[PDB]
Each structure stands twice: as C-alpha cells, then as structure tokens.
Design a protein around this ligand. Sequence first.
Ligand SMILES: Nc1ncnc2c1ncn2[C@@H]1O[C@H](COP(=O)(O)OP(=O)(O)OP(=O)(O)O)[C@@H](O)[C@H]1O
Ligand SMILES: [Ca+2]
Lengths: 13, 361, 139
Amino acid sequence: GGPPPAPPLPAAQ
Amino acid sequence: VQALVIDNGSGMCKAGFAGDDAPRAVFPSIVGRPRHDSYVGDEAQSKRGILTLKYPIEHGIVTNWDDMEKIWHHTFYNELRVAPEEHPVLLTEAPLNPKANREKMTQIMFETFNTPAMYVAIQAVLSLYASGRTTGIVMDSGDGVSHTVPIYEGYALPHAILRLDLAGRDLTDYMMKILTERGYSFTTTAEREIVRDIKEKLAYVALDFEAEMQTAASSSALEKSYELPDGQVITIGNERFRCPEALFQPSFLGMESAGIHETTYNSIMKCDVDIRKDLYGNVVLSGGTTMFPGIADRMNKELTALAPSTMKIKIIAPPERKYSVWIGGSILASLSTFQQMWISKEEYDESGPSIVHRKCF
Amino acid sequence: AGWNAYIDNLMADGTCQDAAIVGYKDSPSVWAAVPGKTFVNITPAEVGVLVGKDRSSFYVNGLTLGGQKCSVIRDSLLQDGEFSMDLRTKSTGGAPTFNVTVTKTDKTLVLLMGKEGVHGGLINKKCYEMASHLRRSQY
Ligand SMILES: Nc1ncnc2c1ncn2[C@@H]1O[C@H](COP(=O)(O)OP(=O)(O)OP(=O)(O)O)[C@@H](O)[C@H]1O
Ligand SMILES: [Ca+2]
C-alpha cells in the first residue's frame, strides 16, 4: 500500500 | 602507547603488552586474606599457611568481584608496573559469559581503573587468531573448564558453543586418586601439587586406549620414574594414560558427559552447513590441558571416525598453545584495525556498561 | 522525513555499504533502502524468517536478505533491551564477506551492512542506536 510518514531525526552533536 | 593484554583464567592469570611475544607475567589467580591486608598471586601462595585463599574465577567465570578487582589492581601496579589510565586494555572472557559479568568488567575498567579504552574478547577466538586463521573450531581446555567454540570470520557462534566441566584440576584430582589406588598416598594440598607435576610431566594420551592398557600389563616398558621432593622414587605405569583418557571418557570420573571429541563434533553439527568443512579443516587445540602428548593424534583419529569419509580433518596444536589465548590477544590489539573496536571512555560515558553488548562479540 | 533521509543518515559516516528500513507488520515492504544494493530487494519471506517463531532452523540453514546469503552469529531480535541480530554474509571464491545487523522496533526492521573490514561491533551499535531512536518515537 504505502508506508507511514517518517518521524524526525535524532538531533545531532 | 601500548595496549595491555590481560587473560584471566580459573587457575592462572597471564598479563602483558600487546606487541610482545609472550606474557610478561604469569601467576596464580588467587587472593589471600589473613586468616583472622591482601596478597595476590605468587605471594599469596607463599603465605598460604597464614592466609585464607580465594579463587575468584570459577569455570572461567567471575564469582567474586572484590577479589577480581584486586587481581586487576595487582596486575597493573605490581606485575606490569603501569598506570591503567594510560593504556587501552584488552580483556579476555569465557565463552558464554553472562551479560551482567560483561557489564561489570566494563564498569570496573572505566570507573575504577579509568582505562582510556577497553575491549572484551572471548578466549577461544583469540586462540584462533594466534594460529593464523579466521574460521575454525576451538577446543579450549584449561584448569577449570572446557569449551568447544565454533568461529566464523572471527565471530564465535554462541548457539553452537558447548561447555564441559571437566578440565585440568579434575585431571589432577583423578591422577591423585588412581595413584592412591596403586599404593602411594596423595590427598593433601601439597600432595596435589606434586601430582599436578606428575601429570604435567609424565601423562599422555593413548591413541588406542585398550591396546595401551594391554601393553602396560604385558611389560613394564611404559613405566616411568618420578622423584619426590621427599627424595623418594615412585613408578608410574598405566596411570600415565588413564588420567588423560578421562577427557575422552568422562565415565572415568563419573560423568555422563560426552568427551571432548564428541562434543567437538556435536558443536560442529550445530553449525551452518556451509562452514562445517572449514571447521573440520581447522580444529584448534588450546589451553594447558591440551599439552598432553598424543592428544592431537587422538583427536584426529576420533573425529575422522565421526566425520564423513571424504571430510578433510586437520588438528592444529601449536607448540605454544599453553598461551594461545594471550598471544592471540597480543596479535589482535596490535593491529591497526583493532583500533576501531575499542570501547572508548566517551562511549562508556555515553552509553554505560551495556555498551559491551553492542560492541564486543 | 521521509524515510530516504533515514538511509542517508545511516550512510553518512561511510562505514556502511547498505541500509534499509523495512516494515514487518501486515504486508511487509521496504520503506527505504540504498538503491542498487542488497537490502532494497528483501522479500516478505525473508522478513518472516527474521521475525518468526522458528529461531533455530536458520543456524544450520542460514537465511537470506535480498538474495544475499548470510550466517547468523547472535540472535536477540525478539529480546527486550537488545532487539538485535548479528549476521555475516557468505561468499564464494574468496570474495569478501561483511557484517550485518538487523534491529527490530514496534513497526520496523533496521538493516545495516558494513563495508569490508568494518567490525560487527560498529555496525551493531549503529543499527541499535537508530532502532532505539525509532522505538522512542513509537515506531
Ligand atoms: N604440559 C602439561 N600437560 C598437562 N597439563 C598441563 C600441562 N601444563 C599445564 N597443564 C595444566 O593446564 C591447566 C592450566 O591451564 P590454563 O592456564 O590454560 O588454565 P586457566 O586459563 O587457568 O583456566 P581455565 O581456562 O580453565 O579458566 C592446569 O590444570 C595445569 O596442570
Ligand atoms: Ca583460560
């Protein structure tokens, strides 16, 4: 069908 | 500059510097406390008359973390004379070491000793390294435990690892007893030590056991003499080979277990079909209890008989196999590629002791 | 967002040659993967092996990922706290093999393949961190 929307990426260092 | 290598066993600890060809320090895994502050190693054994002696490693596994910590402290400060905060440390572990133990070693290194970096490697894997291979099966037998360990490209395969509680100390004990059944007495602690030397000096593995037994009853040709420290001379006959026969026949010790040869086959058989030939082709012996003469040949024979008739079988039993673990560790920690594999202090700080689970396997 | 960005995050540091995010519920499908590599071709059958009830057969048989034959080293995929499986590829003719980690979340599998000579440890840690972020997001 289709996949869910991606959540936000983990913040970076 | 130099990484350190520490191989902690049930009986003996081996410590040194990566790069070196031998451990700089080999000493008994013992902590002694006055019977009513603490000594480790050879000093504890010397003062064993006035100390309570503890063995913090049992069957390859740490059972007393305060004692272990003292061994490590002693290792760093007295035997190697280094400060642990200046060296990355490679530590060894038993196959199938409980997760909590692995975390505890990590935490102690980083929090107690301030190591800048550390790694924990399975003992049998390091032995494979020392023999120049990446894939094979290791049969490791020390003072308190035996294991068969299938390894693929450097990675042990826990599902197929087998354990046998039957090793050097049991062998020593069994020798004590059969000699006692022969007439001479052996029961005490200093007697045990004599018998262990007899074992180390005169025992061997027979190729065909039932034939050796007849041979020893037919003539006194396989009879060897041993001088006690008491000056006196005793003669040992078939005991020479009956002692080590227990590795192949654990009934001799009242065990239902399979022997080393059969447990090697059993481990192989749990492996991926595609590697079984590479295992059969690279059976590596390691540990002190593999120093018996005749052992490699006996293993060759026993496995050939369990294998497919076309299977190529090769037993690798290096002459330096008593310290195959350390040596392998020395080799590994010296590689430029091992530098990626360290747990850094920043990583420990970031993740905690459970980092060892992601990183060491 | 979307999922392709997850693949670029994973490939950013240059240790990896392949990455995939795969949904394992319902009708399994790859949500993102590096094109022209292996993971982009995993099948629902391959996925169900990974997540299924039979956790021993794959030791003697191996398993596959996008057709690539791999050997199982560690299985903790269904375990709370670890949620991972480590694998090594198989090859023929002396061609290089590579380390793989699969990590499992609420809805996804995360799959990573190391470049030559990259330790299974780096790959596991990496795939685990990403899974851990996804679990924290209810994914
Ligand atoms: N030449 C020899 N022949 C037979 N046995 C030997 C010989 N040399 C040492 N051993 C035995 O090997 C054992 C110790 O070996 P090793 O150092 O590999 O064990 P460990 O690492 O202390 O213990 P483990 O691996 O079981 O935790 C002792 O039982 C010792 O008597
Ligand atoms: Ca050992």
